[PDB]
Amino acid sequence: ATYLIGDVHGCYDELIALLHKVEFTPGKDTLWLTGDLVARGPGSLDVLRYVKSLGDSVRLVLGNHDLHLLAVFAGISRNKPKDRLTPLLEAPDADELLNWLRRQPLLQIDEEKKLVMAHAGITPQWDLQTAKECARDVEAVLSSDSYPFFLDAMYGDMPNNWSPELRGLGRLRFITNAFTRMRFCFPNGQLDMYSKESPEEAPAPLKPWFAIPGPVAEEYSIAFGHWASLEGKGTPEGIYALDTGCCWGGTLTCLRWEDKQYFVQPSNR
Ligand SMILES: [Mn+2]
Ligand SMILES: [Mn+2]
Secondary structure (H helix, E strand, O other), X not given: OEEEEOOOOOOHHHHHHHHHHOOOOEXXXXXXXXXXXXXXXXXXHHHHHHHHHHHHHEEEOOOHHHHHHHHHHOOOOXXXXXXXXXXXXXXXXXXXXXXXXXXXXXXXXXXXXXEEEEOOOOOOOOOHHHHHHHHHHHHHHHHOOXXXXXXXXXXXXXXXXXXXXXXXXXXXXXXXXXXXXXXXXXXXXXXXXXXXXXXXXXXXXXXXXXXXXOHHHHHOEEEEOOOHHHOOOOOOOOEEEOOOEHHHOOEEEEEEOOOOEEEEEEOOO
């Protein structure tokens, strides 16, 4: 069976309980995770150990908090007390875990299921070939010995409009923002980097990225996490918003793909 779970955010107990609910069995089952495995919840260390141990039974994409953790580890960015990352950063296997984490994809595609996953979704300004090329380029910098320099370069809110002519720092910044920070778009597809509200509370003319028809979403289903204020609701057919805010006191959501059946684990707070 195929299971898809939204943002775990260090909620190790809830993750394990939800996987026991569906009797997840590596080797017979595969798990997709929308990223943001770490921060906020108490168990980032155990979450990373377990997900890494799953090997080929898990298909992960990296989220914005996974990237922030990598930036802290590399000495690029400052640790925030509220993220509760110190046990993981001080663990004897931190190097092993974070070197594995930075090698994980930004984008997962399954052609037999016609299914695409990224942390924040697929910007309507991208077709599938471009999304794949951009994911490959950022994965290449993150997998390289020089990844601290990329992590430093990635910070920024511009440019917010895609063009195949983008080069260098602006290209990498847009790719990073589209995959891991996107929520709202302007009518022309341009990213808005500020509003994190639910679609009903957002200012005009902002619309959710998935409300703008795009070539990937016309052919593929898209699963994503990231957007907690969306609460997993309000999406069109073929769009699966899996982040129901477990770390925030919401729920951890798991979707079984074969029958589109949902399983929910309440947050423990
Ligand atoms: Mn996120
Ligand atoms: Mn998140």
